[PDB]
Amino acid sequence: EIVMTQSPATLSVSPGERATLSCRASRSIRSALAWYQHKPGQAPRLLIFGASTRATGIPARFSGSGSGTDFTLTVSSIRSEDSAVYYCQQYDFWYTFGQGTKLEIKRTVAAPSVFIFPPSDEQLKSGTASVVCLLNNFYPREAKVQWKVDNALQSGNSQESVTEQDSKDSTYSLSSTLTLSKADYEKHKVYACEVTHQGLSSPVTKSFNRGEC
Amino acid sequence: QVQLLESGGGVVRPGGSLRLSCAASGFNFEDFGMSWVRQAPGKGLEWVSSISWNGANIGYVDSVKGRFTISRDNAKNSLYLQMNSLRAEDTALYYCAIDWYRDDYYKMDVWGKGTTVTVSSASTKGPSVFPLAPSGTAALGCLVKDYFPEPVTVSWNSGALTSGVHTFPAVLQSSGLYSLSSVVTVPSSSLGTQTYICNVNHKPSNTKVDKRVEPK
Ligand SMILES: OC[C@H]1O[C@@H](O[C@@H]2[C@@H](OC[C@H]3O[C@H](OC[C@H]4O[C@H](O)[C@@H](O)[C@@H]4O)[C@@H](O)[C@@H]3O)O[C@H](CO)[C@H]2O)[C@@H](O)[C@@H]1O
Numbered sequence: 001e002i003v004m005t006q007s008p009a010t011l012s013v014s015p016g017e018r019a020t021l022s023c024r025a026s027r028s029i030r031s032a033l034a035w036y037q038h039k040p041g042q043a044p045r046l047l048i049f050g051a052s053t054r055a056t057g058i059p060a061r062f063s064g065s066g067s068g069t070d071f072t073l074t075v076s077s078i079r080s081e082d083s084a085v086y087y088c089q090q091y092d093f094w095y096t097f098g099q100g101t102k103l104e105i106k107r108t109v110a111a112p113s114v115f116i117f118p119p120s121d122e123q124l125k126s127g128t129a130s131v132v133c134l135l136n137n138f139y140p141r142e143a144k145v146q147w148k149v150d151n152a153l154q155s156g157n158s159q160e161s162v163t164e165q166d167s168k169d170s171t172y173s174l175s176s177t178l179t180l181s182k183a184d185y186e187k188h189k190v191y192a193c194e195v196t197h198q199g200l201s202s203p204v205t206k207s208f209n210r211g212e213c
Numbered sequence: 214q215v216q217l218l219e220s221g222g223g224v225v226r227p228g229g230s231l232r233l234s235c236a237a238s239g240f241n242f243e244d245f246g247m248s249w250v251r252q253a254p255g256k257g258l259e260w261v262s263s264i265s266w267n268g269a270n271i272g273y274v275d276s277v278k279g280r281f282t283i284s285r286d287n288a289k290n291s292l293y294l295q296m297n298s299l300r301a302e303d304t305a306l307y308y309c310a311i312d313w314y315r316d317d318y319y320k321m322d323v324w325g326k327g328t329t330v331t332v333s334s335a336s337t338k339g340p341s342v343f344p345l346a347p348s349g350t351a352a353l354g355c356l357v358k359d360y361f362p363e364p365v366t367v368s369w370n371s372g373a374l375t376s377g378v379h380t381f382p383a384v385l386q387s388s389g390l391y392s393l394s395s396v397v398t399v400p401s402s403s404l405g406t407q408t409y410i411c412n413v414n415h416k417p418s419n420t421k422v423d424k425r426v427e428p429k
Pocket residue numbers: 091092093094095245246247263264265266269270271272312313315316317319
């Protein structure tokens with residue numbers, strides 16, 4: 001079986017610059033090499049076939065070259081919409097994808113907008129309380145969220161989720177969900193979400209008092 | 214437009230079997246070779262199998278030889294994949310795609326949306342949908358909790374509201390069930406005027422929920 005090796009694994013490049021992606025086959029595939037763009041939530045999109053031929057509708061800023069075992073894709077005038085995983089694929093003898101290169105768009109720093117949501121009364125009927133903290137439209141991806149319940153620091157009862165990079169503004173968003181039993185939730189008053197991020201002058205706390213407003 | 218539509222995914226026990234289908238429309242199905250391509254969770258695209266336009270050339274990735282069988286029915290404009298002796302590594306989204314136009318040239322620029330195959334002993338469970346109620350810019354959303362397996366789809370106002378929407382990837386809870394939230398930022402002044410409804414669909418358990426998110 002042919003082994004396709006792509007490098008680098010990940011890439012972080014600012015809008016307007018250019019990036020070159022490399023693909024190697026373990027044996028010669030002649031010119032039967034294709035490049036694909038795969039945005040999260042969409043089907044793969046063919047960019048290049050024949051090592052160097054742009055597919056229909058692909059702009060000239062996608063440039064492919066190579067022959068035999070060594071191939072490159074160069075993407076210039078990079079835009080926020082280019083945030084995706086890029087794969088090569090040999091089709092000289094059936095088909096084999098490389099492991100892909102994940103391209104992140106290095107926009108400027110953006111601080112999170114923080115929101116906290118108390119459990120709905122409907123959920124409390126089930127015997128569980130989910131407290132959700134939202135960190136909206138921030139960059140870079142790294143952020144720390146700490147939960148405080150009546151000023152007591154929480155640990156082990158939260159779970160985080162991060163969106164894929166936004167194709168329009170290149171930000172991320174993050175949710176932290178604090179899960180407690182209804183009984184534990186009704187024992188305390190102050191539920192706080194504290195957010196740390198390089199775009200914030202000091203850690204931001206959003207909180208609510210159980211049963212108010 | 215030109216279209217490929219996969220179906221047949223679902224939950225199957227390890228060692229079990231499943232048949233996927235792929236319906237083509239908008240082109241001469243009989244002119245094109247077809248491939249199945251899968252993406253396992255957290256992994257890259259992997260070519261699985263191909264059958265040429267006239268069925269004369271059929272190929273399989275080594276790890277599915279003897280387990281999977283690809284076939285086509287040109288009269289029904291349909292491609293099939295019989296998947297036997299399912300393993301955990303078969304858990305994936307399964308795409309169909311054209312590959313070649315006859316034996317003339319590689320094309321492979323038409324892909325489906327994928328159907329999800331989950332190899333698990335666990336039971337199917339539909340989600341509960343709870344409101345994330347608002348308190349210049351306001352945030353609101355829906356909590357889609359305790360479902361299995363993946364995925365669920367979330368829209369807002371039946372797809373009319375798209376700007377500012379963030380639907381988070383699901384997290385696996387310690388219970389073995391999945392949970393996610395979908396949020397949206399909206400103008401704070403429109404809270405009393407505009408109606409906000411999340412539309413949650415979990416096909417594996419035939420659960421469709423429309424939840425109204427209102428200020429408390
Ligand atoms: O022609 C397009 C159609 O073919 C497949 O893709 C080709 C595929 O070939 C790999 C090798 O398979 C062939 O070997 C079998 C040969 O012998 C028997 O007589 C027949 O079954 C068959 O003709 C050999 O010719 C090839 O080297 O790999 C490439 C994929 O890009 C194609 O050349 C299908 O994928 C495609 O629909």
